[PDB]
Amino acid sequence: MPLHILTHRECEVLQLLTDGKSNRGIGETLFISEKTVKNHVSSILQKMKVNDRTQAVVTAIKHGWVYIR
Amino acid sequence: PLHILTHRECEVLQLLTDGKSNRGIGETLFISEKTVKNHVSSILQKMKVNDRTQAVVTAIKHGWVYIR
């Protein structure tokens, strides 16, 4: 399950990243600061045991946790 | 516009979709990281995106690369 390992906010960040949004775009969409976006990304890399956004995103797509809009 | 990427740029893009680092890509393709970094920089320029994640997600969307 995604929610066994991620929060809902983290799932939303991952989907917004899969959509192609930047840290600025994600914060705009979620009304959070860019630093906070990076904090969510930092947590996602920890929980998924990957080293950057791209591995996390490609892994989320691979497991069906997010979709290509 | 797939025609604008070189085959080598496509290989780097596929290796990025696989999850390899610039060190892994340089290892796999027997090139230096500086050469890999330039290929990445070139791919973002030709694709008109700002970072690796947008390039990879855009290539997946259009079927240029596959999830191994």
Residue numbers in the entry:
A (entry chain A): 160 to 228
B (entry chain B): 161 to 228
Sentences from the paper on this structure:
DegU transcriptionally activates the expression of GmaR and flagellar proteins by binding the operator DNA in the fliN-gmaR promoter as a response regulator of a two-component regulatory system. lmDegU contains an N-terminal receiver domain (RD; residues 1–143) and a C-terminal DNA-binding domain (DBD; residues 159–228), which are connected by a 15-residue linker (residues 144–158). Therefore, we conclude that DegU is a noncanonical response regulator that is constitutively active irrespective of phosphorylation.
The crystal structure of lmDegUDBD was determined by molecular replacement and was refined to an Rfree value of 25.3% for the X-ray diffraction data with a resolution of up to 2.39 Å. The asymmetric unit of the lmDegUDBD crystal contains two lmDegUDBD chains (chains A and B), which have essentially identical structures with a root-mean-square deviation value of 0.50 Å. lmDegUDBD adopts a one-domain structure with a tetrahelical helix-turn-helix (HTH) motif as observed for a LuxR-type DNA-binding HTH domain that belongs to the GerE (PF00196) family in the Pfam database. The lmDegUDBD structure consists of four α-helices (α7, α8, α9, and α10), and the two adjacent helices are linked by a 3–4 residue loop. In the lmDegUDBD structure, the α9 helix is the most elongated helix with 15 residues and forms a base frame that supports the other three shorter α-helices. The α9 helix is defined as a recognition helix, which has been shown to be required for dsDNA binding in GerE family members. The dimerization interface of lmDegUDBD (buried surface area, ~ 500 Å2) is mainly located at the α10 helix with additional contributions from the C-terminal region of the α7 helix and the α7-α8 and α9-α10 loops. Each of the three lmDegUDBD mutants (lmDegUDBDR168A, lmDegUDBDN198A, and lmDegUDBDR212A) exhibited lower dsDNA-binding affinity in the FP assay than lmDegUDBD, indicating that the continuous positive patch of the lmDegUDBD dimer covering the R168, R212, and N198 residues mediates dsDNA recognition.
